[PDB]
Structure formats: C-alpha cells, structure tokens
A paper describes a structure:
Then, we resolved two antigen-antibody complex structures. The two complexes were solved at resolutions of 2.07 Å and 3.0 Å, respectively. Next, we evaluated the neutralizing activity of these three antibodies against Omicron variants, BA.5, BF.7 and XBB, respectively. The results were shown in Figure S7 ; none of the antibodies could neutralize any one of the three variants. So, we presume that Omicron would escape both the antibodies. It implies that VH experiences a greater selective pressure than Vκ during affinity maturation, which is consistent with the notion that VH play a more important role in the RBD binding than Vκ, as suggested by the structures of RBD-antibody complexes.
Residue numbers in the entry:
A (entry chain E): 333 to 527
B (entry chain A): 3 to 216
C (entry chain B): 1 to 221
Amino acid sequence: TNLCPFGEVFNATRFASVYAWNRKRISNCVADYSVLYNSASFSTFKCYGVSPTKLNDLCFTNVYADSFVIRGDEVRQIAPGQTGKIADYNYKLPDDFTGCVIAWNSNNLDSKVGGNYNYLYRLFRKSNLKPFERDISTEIYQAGSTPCNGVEGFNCYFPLQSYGFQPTNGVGYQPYRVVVLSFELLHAPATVCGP
Amino acid sequence: SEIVLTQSPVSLSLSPGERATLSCRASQSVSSYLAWYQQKPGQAPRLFIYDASKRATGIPARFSGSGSGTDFTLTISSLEPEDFAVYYCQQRSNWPRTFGQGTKVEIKRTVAAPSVFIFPPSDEQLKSGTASVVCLLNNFYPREAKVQWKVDNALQSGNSQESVTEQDSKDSTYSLSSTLTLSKADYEKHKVYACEVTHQGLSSPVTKSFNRGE
Amino acid sequence: EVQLVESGGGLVQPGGSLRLSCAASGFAFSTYEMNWVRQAPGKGLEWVSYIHNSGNPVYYADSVKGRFTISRDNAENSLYLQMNSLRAEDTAIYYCARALRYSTSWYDYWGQGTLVTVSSASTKGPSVFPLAPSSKSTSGGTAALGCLVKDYFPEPVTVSWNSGALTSGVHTFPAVLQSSGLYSLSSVVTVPSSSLGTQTYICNVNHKPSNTKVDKKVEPK
Ligand SMILES: *[C@@H]1O[C@H](CO)[C@@H](O)[C@H](O)[C@H]1NC(C)=O
C-alpha cells in the first residue's frame, strides 16, 4: 500500500522555469488519480489518449511528472500539435501524447510586487525542440553575421527572457503552475497501477 | 603579474564640438580584452566601449575605440557638453580586472579672474578654542591658482588647506576655498589678516583684507 | 525597473569587520555574473571581487585575499561581501556591479554605492558657523556669504540653502580631513549686492550618521 508521491509535485514550494522543466518519476506505488480531477481546484485538466475518469483502473510501468511555470496565455501550448515560444523552444509534447496536462493559477505564489524575475523562458533558438527535450544551454544567440564571442550585444541576444510576473497583471499574463503526467508502458510488469 | 594600464594624457581641455583621443597602454599583451568607462562626479561609472571596439547599449556613434595588444585608443569625434567626464580603461585578460588611473576631460574656456572674498572667524566659534579664517576664490576658469595667507604681512605655510569644486556645469568655472585655522590665543595675537591671490586672469596678485576688530 | 541597492556600510574601527548586501530587482539575477568595485575618495576604480552565476569561480583583488569573501543568493536575489580585518586602506565607496552575460567583467549596471569608512575616530556631529558678507560690499554687483561646516567625522554631509529654494550661485566645497581626523567644509553662495537687509539666507546642514539637522541664519554684523 505504497501511495504515489503526488504531493511532492503538485504542492512543491518552488516550481522550475519552463526552459529547465523538472521531471519526476513515479514508480512502484499506488496512484488514485481520481482525487486529482475530482477536486475541481484546477483550471485546466485535459487528458489525451486515456480518459481522465476511470483512469485509475489501468496499469503503467512508469509515470513522468513534468512541472514548470508559464503564463496564462501559454497554457494552451502544452498540448499535442501546438506551436509557440513555449512549445517550440521550451517544452514540446508528442503528437501521439497519451496523458494528462494539469494547470492552475499561481498568481498568489509566483507573483511579487515590483515583478518576480526568477521564472525564465527561452526566447531565441535556431530550431524547434524535439518532444520531451530539455535545453538548458545559456549560450549567446547569434542573430547576425558577426560572431558574438560569448558577449550579448548588437545582434547577439541572451537566449533566456524573464517573465517578470506582477500581481496586477492580466490573467493571460499571470503565472500558472503546470503538471504534465506522461503514462509510459514499458515491457517491465507495470509498477504504477493505482487502484 | 599585475597588468598595469597607464592612460594618456593625465588631463585634457577641449572646446565642445572638438575631436578627442585618449590613450591606454598595457604592460603586456591583453589582446582585445579592454573596455572604456565614463564617470561623472558623484556617480557610478558607465560602460561605453567593450572589447576595444564594441559600443555598449545606448552609446552614441561619436564614441569609438580601436587597438589591440598593448595600445588602445578611445575617440570622441565631436565633444558634446555631456561627454566631459573622467574615462577609465579596464582589462579582462588577467585577474585582477585592473583599471587605468583615469583621463579627465574638462571644458576649454576663455580666461576669467575670480572674485575674492575673505571671511573673519565667527564670534560663536571664538567661544570655542579655535579660529577659522576663510578665503573664497569664486568662478575662475584656469584651475591653476595660487593662494597665500598673510598674518601681519608674514605668510605662513601648513595652517591653510584648500578645496576646489568641479568645473561648474554652467559657466565652466572652478571655485576654490582656502581655510586658515588658528587657535583663539594666536588669533588674538595679530592684527591684520589678508589673502593674496595669484591667477592668469589677474595682472597683479589681488589681496583682500580685514582687521581683527572690524 | 532594474535596481541595485547596496547597504550595510558605515564606520568600522580599524581591524574590525563588515558585511555588505546588494538587493537586485528587475532582471534575472541568477543568470548574471556579479562583482564588487571600490573607489577611494578622489581616486580611481579598483575591482574587489568576482562571482559566477553558479558561484564556484571566485576571484579577489590580491590585496584583499583571505580577508574578503563574496557570496550570492540566486533565490532571494542578493549579493554579499564579507569584509574582515579591515584597514584604513579599505575606505571607499563599494559599488555592486552587474556584468554583461559571460564577459565576467564588463559591468552593465551599477548600484549607487555605499560608503565604507574604516577609522578609529568616533562619530561626531558638525559645528556650523556663518560666513557673514563683507561690510560695505558693493552697490549692485555681487556679495558672497555662506556657512562653514567643521569637525564632523563621518564624511557625508548635506548642505542646502533655504530648504532647496536657493540653488543658483551655491558652491558646497569638497571636505578636507584635518590633522585631528575630522572633516571640515564650506558652502558659499553669491547673491545681489543690495539684497542683504531685505532677503534672508539660511543654511540647512544635515549629517545622517548623527541624526543632526543644524540650520543657521547668516546676515551681516
Ligand atoms: C496538496 O495539499 C492539499 C492541502 O494540504 C491537499 O488537499 C492536496 O491533496 C495536496 N496535493 C496532492 C497532490 O496530494
């Protein structure tokens, strides 16, 4: 009767930046997923491939819990077949995504008077990320003919940009904490059933 | 080894709209790791040029820099009034990021003799055991001025102490104050206190005088 | 708005210690290299210490090794400098410097700086004496007058005239450190020759390290 540690993910004091999105593995435990949606405390709870209800009657080998913070008008990008700065350069989901995307407003926790600049997103990148790719490189982005030589300047940009969340921002500009559950069914006898 | 950056010249006096060139020589090769800063009095420095040719954000085009190895030049094509300040050069090829000792760019101007005022000690200060006599040199261009105190027409040295303002933003002049501090006992031992002032704008050293008992 | 607020300065007895703190806001402080730069009064710039955004690459000026140590908090966005075994040589304004990403030494943005003064002298307020205008000055040209601010140890003083209403012609001179170890300073203003009995001029001398506010009327004798 080992219960899956969802409290560590959803109730974490600090969430990671989207460019450095954190990944947690759920294995060898019981996950009663129904308490998650049958709580009505989130603003987005979509499941793809699998169905959110009667979802805890299935067995998987491993469950991945990806967590990060984006603003309100980028939550729609956390979905299969989406485009945008977050989907292209920060966090990409496969077209064949089977799993659940969970988000809720976190203006009370991640916004500060004068701006909370701890949360970052990747603004410049040559090519789109592959699905489930983490790019933490902070190399100066060359957008011109002259070499940057590691110094930001004309046509040489630092790849990461700060959200600067403020409590008086618009809802689309407000911070949202996102948890992505990936259901991976490897060959090993399924270790996360969760009656 | 401490990479010594020696700047040139020590001071530079030019009129607005003139071209300005500043030197910074390194003891050993820094390659291209050198930048230029600008600092106005009572303020933190401001990055202008970096990597010996690249301009910082918001730096106007009239500023430029070149050079490599051990010799570097900063160029202001046409001096605006707000470009008159102190400029430092800094290297990042060896810890520690040593600086030059500064090149100060002052406004060239026409000659102006100062207005001279002498101030006797206050009665309130003489209720203390000290007496301070203050000579004021006001609004003169050439910063080079000579001030000699005279007590019964016998000048001293050591008891005066000078202080010079920055070039006033408006008339581009300098103001100097020399302070002759004496004990009350020695102050009430002599009779006439005078301040002789020599300057380029003065065709004769001007003295201002007062007598102890008004 | 990008901000850099240094604090924690002040007086220290020679051989004591301090800790300075830098409050960053308006930018991703965790992605920047940080530095400390001193400037002694009337002298040039000297680089003090360097810290990487990760924090392990640490360098100091050779003259302050073993005595100074630098630290940074990427969560609370704060830079610190611990100073130990302080000498009178360390008397300077210590700026908190913000370096262009991964140049390690081209300082984008500077704080206003805080003044660290290391000396055995004790805090003392300033005596304020007037500098009365010359008796029988002139008819219409100019007359000069001011206050003399003498014998205050902590260096910053604020001298204004008529509560900031008298600004033209004012010359607040730089201070000079006397043989005693105490600072002395004059502030003078030039005013119309025949306006002395009609108009009143008054100093506003302020010394923050002593909670002192001395106003002084300055009129002829
Ligand atoms: C987070 O905490 C709340 C209140 O303590 C609790 O109701 C909720 O179940 C927790 N989240 C998870 C995933 O357990």
